[PDB]
Amino acid sequence: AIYHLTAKTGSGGQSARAKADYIQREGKYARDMDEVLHAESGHMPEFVERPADYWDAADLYERANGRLFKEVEFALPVELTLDQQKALASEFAQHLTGAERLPYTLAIHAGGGENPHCHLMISERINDGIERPAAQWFKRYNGKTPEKGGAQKTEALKPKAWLEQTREAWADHANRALERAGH
C-alpha cells in the first residue's frame, strides 16, 4: 500500500522547543501523553542533557533567517505491531540522519487507532563529534578551525529531488518491514 510522506522547514513563527514538546507530549503537554506511543532522539552533541535542550538552543541561538529544523511526517503500516513500528521508524530516521549524524527527535502517534503516524524533526547541523557550548553550536562554521566555530550545516535536505527520493526510500523501508513481518 501507499504510506504518504510530507515535509516542511521551520524558521514563520516556528519554535523548535514548542514543536518538540508537542509531538513528544512533554512539558506543558505532560498531562496528555496517550497520543504518544514512542519517542526518541539521536546524534545529540555533548552539551545536550535532554533532547529539549538542543531545541531550546536552536531557538535561542539560530539566526532569524536560519532553518531551525526540517519536519517530516509519514504514515505507519497499521498491520505492523508497535515494536515493528518502533523499529521501522527508528530505522528510517537513521536512514535520513545517520550518515552526517544530524541531531533529530521523532515521535510515533496513535492517530485515533486507524492512522498511526510518525513526526520527525531533523536539525541540519552535522555532528562532527567536536564539543561546542550551546551558545556556539549554531554559530557559523569555521572550515579552517572547526572547534572555534559552530557545527557545519548540511545541504543534503535542500535538493528538489529530495522529497520524492525520501518517499521512495520510505516506501522501500515500509515495504521491506511488511514482508519480513509476514504481511
Min separation Cβ 168 and Mn ion, Å? 12
Contact 93, 102 (CB under 8 A): no
Q: Which residues bind Mn ion (CB under 5 A)?
A: 95, 98, 109
Min separation Cβ 101 and Mn ion, Å? 6
86 vs 95 by CB, closer to Mn ion: 95
Q: Is 141 a catalytic residue?
A: no
Min separation Cβ 40 and Mn ion, Å? 12
59 vs 71 by CB, closer to Mn ion: 71
Check 3, 22, 29, 61 and give the catalytic one.
Answer: 22
List CB contacts of 127: < 8 A, sequence separation 6 or more: 43, 44, 45, 100, 101, 102, 103, 151
3-state class of 105 per DSSP? Answer: strand
67 vs 109 by CB, closer to Mn ion: 109
User: What's the DSSP call for residue 31?
Assistant: G
Angstrom CA distances, 142 to 16, 39, 41, 73, 81, stand at 25, 33, 26, 33, 46
Catalytic residues: 22
